[PDB]
Design a protein around this ligand. Structure first.
Ligand SMILES: C[C@@H]1CCc2cc(F)cc3c(=O)c(C(=O)O)cn1c23
Ligand SMILES: C[C@@H]1CCc2cc(F)cc3c(=O)c(C(=O)O)cn1c23
Ligand SMILES: C[C@@H]1CCc2cc(F)cc3c(=O)c(C(=O)O)cn1c23
Ligand SMILES: C[C@@H]1CCc2cc(F)cc3c(=O)c(C(=O)O)cn1c23
Ligand code: PRO
Ligand code: PRO
Ligand code: PRO
Ligand code: PRO
Ligand SMILES: [Cl-]
Ligand SMILES: [Cl-]
Ligand SMILES: [Zn+2]
Lengths: 336, 339
């Protein structure tokens, strides 16, 4: 009976429905031009997120629903798939911020003028100012013709993922949260790893900025900045990401220290990386987190760890899944 | 190695980073101050939900022997604990402008009446390494320093979700730390009785209403409020929930609140009958809990330490077995179910 109308979905519509999701879950109907999708929504109790101390909650549908939600005080996201394409509904609470976000996402499409712009990008009203935006990331990338971007314990162990907003960079909370949600879900999807780890993401600003466009030099400087940062004292065994909106030289989406995190030996800020957070490249943080957990490049073009950027968000390599799970305390005898 | 909160410099960031680290299994946190120490086992309150104008507010509990509660929103944090029978709150707002405004708001009643030991009742807390990072208020000591007038009252497999819809009266200003403290105390007064968390989970929401009491009279004010709910198009389909009109202040004759007695039953709730009005000011904790008590059928108790005592006392729990049975039965409980 509860429902979300995709022709007029606002922050208030998403917040009132998601805030009613109790421990037992709730059925919510997604309604789109007379066609409906019933989703069983549950609170994500494994991942915690703060962005500059602002609490962000995640929600999951069933496996067959391929639907996830994000909810903060300032914004809400609905993300699902249609013909394998990623579709996001992004809604900001404040009128000024929603207007700014709608202009930010509309601007690239105004440079070009595609006849099918509505299916890739659309401002949603309900009607002078928009209440949300709809973006089909797969369709948007083909219209914009962007450059080709390249690359058992009784309680689970809490692992912090400390994300640091690069000096001078602007990141958008819906985009950063989507990267974090996809990264955490890429780990829990492997060998029942929610039994071993619960990921806690935090976002702060750092004084560090990459000294050039080079990703390799940038990561050397970032890891060195962590060792000299007085705020990071006592946290050398956590996972770190330098984040920005943009990419590095040669359209590199991110970079990280391979096989640098193990639950028993983590130290000296070794488990560090850098990642873009822009909406058009989902799964970059997930790919770099996989690399930090020991995953190598995979040969399946549908693998999250494929050498080229693909848009796929899950580990498919059995060798990588075993390496990642073993680094988080799992053993074959434990099962899935 | 044990996590700790230094009450001589406690800020919003200190409280948020500690409370955001509380997982499903709980966490030990040491509360420290000059001549004071308390180890508390903190847990997330998974029974109560709160939105204030759609802003999510989370509650945290200590063990019964810890006598400690917390509140955490994106904009503010509260630590409240009892020490030598006195309620002490540490209130910290995230934004510097809002923290400065809140510190001035709480300091203003004291500046008029300069008492010798004002520090034990009210104190602006500053960072150790200048604007305040939090305020400390001992309500019991504050009442003895201030010349306040005597405010009183008029002489299942899954729990059921019950919404408590609080409406900010037109022309009133309420503070989020104050409203949340009233809601937390009200919900905890219910769960403390007959294991009622098995039957009900309270979900508080706060919106603004166009309604304003036509006079200072509480009886007339409640008549108008219940009538405004029946005429409110936003309330259509929600006549079986619980409602409160809230303000900062009090009504005529220093009346703290008012409500329709025995107006909520999980099986027959309807026509906006389960409605009341409540002050939310910090100096009168438990007013919403007392009015929610009346709506659930609790009568005046004779013990001066009961939440339901006819006069305002500051106590936050039902002690009357007769009232506890009436309240629990109205929420679906039976004696055979046990506690
Ligand atoms: C989830 C839905 C919309 C938001 C909402 C706000 C509120 F104050 C009360 C209710 C509410 O009472 C409800 C229900 O059917 O029990 C459903 N919702 C509510
Ligand atoms: C103390 C907290 C966790 C560790 C940490 C690592 C780091 F590199 C930067 C920060 C950091 O910047 C921060 C802050 O409040 O701004 C808090 N932490 C940091
Ligand atoms: C709860 C405490 C202070 C806040 C905090 C921020 C953060 F980014 C990382 C940690 C953190 O890693 C930690 C720990 O010991 O595991 C404790 N805290 C952290
Ligand atoms: C729809 C939601 C729950 C029911 C409700 C009762 C009421 F008396 C006032 C409001 C109400 O004012 C409101 C809002 O968004 O402003 C939402 N709800 C209300
Ligand atoms: O979510 C809402 O209700 C408003 C409408 C536009 C921006 N935010
Ligand atoms: O909580 C904090 O970190 C800051 C300090 C004063 C205002 N808020
Ligand atoms: O305080 C009361 O009301 C109950 C009645 C008997 C003694 N205790
Ligand atoms: O009045 C009551 O019910 C509690 C229990 C016995 C005495 N006081
Ligand atoms: Cl104290
Ligand atoms: Cl103890
Ligand atoms: Zn009374």
């Amino acid at each position: 009976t509860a429902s979300i109308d995709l022709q007029s979905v606002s922050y208030t519509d998403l917040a009132t429905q998601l805030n009613d999701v109790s421990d037992f879950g709730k059925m919510i109907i997604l309604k789109d031009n007379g066609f409906n999708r019933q989703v069983h929504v549950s609170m994500d109790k494994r991942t915690k997120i703060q962005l500059d101390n602002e609490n962000v909650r995640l929600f999951n549908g069933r496996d067959k629903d391929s639907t996830n939600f994000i909810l903060g005080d300032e914004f809400a996201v609905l993300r699902f798939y249609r013909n394998g394409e990623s579709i996001s509904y992004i809604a900001y609470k404040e009128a000024q911020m929603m207007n700014e976000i709608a202009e930010f996402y509309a601007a690239p499409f105004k440079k070009t003028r595609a006849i099918n712009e509505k299916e890739a990008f659309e401002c949603i009203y309900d009607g002078k100012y928009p209440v949300s935006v709809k973006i089909n990331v797969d369709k948007a990338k083909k219209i914009l013709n962007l450059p080709e971007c390249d690359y058992v314990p009784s309680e689970p162990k809490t692992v912090y993922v400390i994300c640091l907003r690069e000096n001078g960079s602007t990141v958008y909370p819906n985009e950063v949260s989507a990267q974090m949600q996809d990264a955490a879900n890429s780990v829990y999807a492997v060998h029942g790893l929610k039994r071993y780890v619960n990921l806690h993401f935090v976002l702060y600003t750092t004084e560090y900025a990459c000294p050039s466009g080079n990703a390799d030099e940038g990561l050397d400087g970032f890891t060195a900045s962590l060792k000299a940062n007085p705020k990071a004292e006592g946290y050398d065994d956590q996972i770190y990401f330098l984040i920005r909106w943009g990419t590095w030289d040669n359209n590199i989406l991110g970079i990280s220290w391979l096989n640098s995190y193990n639950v028993n030996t983590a130290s000296d800020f070794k488990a560090s990386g850098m990642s873009t957070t822009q909406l058009m490249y989902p799964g970059v943080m997930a790919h770099e987190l996989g690399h930090i957990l020991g995953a190598n490049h995979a040969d399946d073009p549908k693998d999250l760890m494929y050498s080229k950027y693909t848009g796929y968000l899950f580990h498919l390599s059995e060798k990588n899944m075993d390496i990642i799970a073993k680094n988080l305390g799992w053993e074959i005898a434990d099962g899935d």
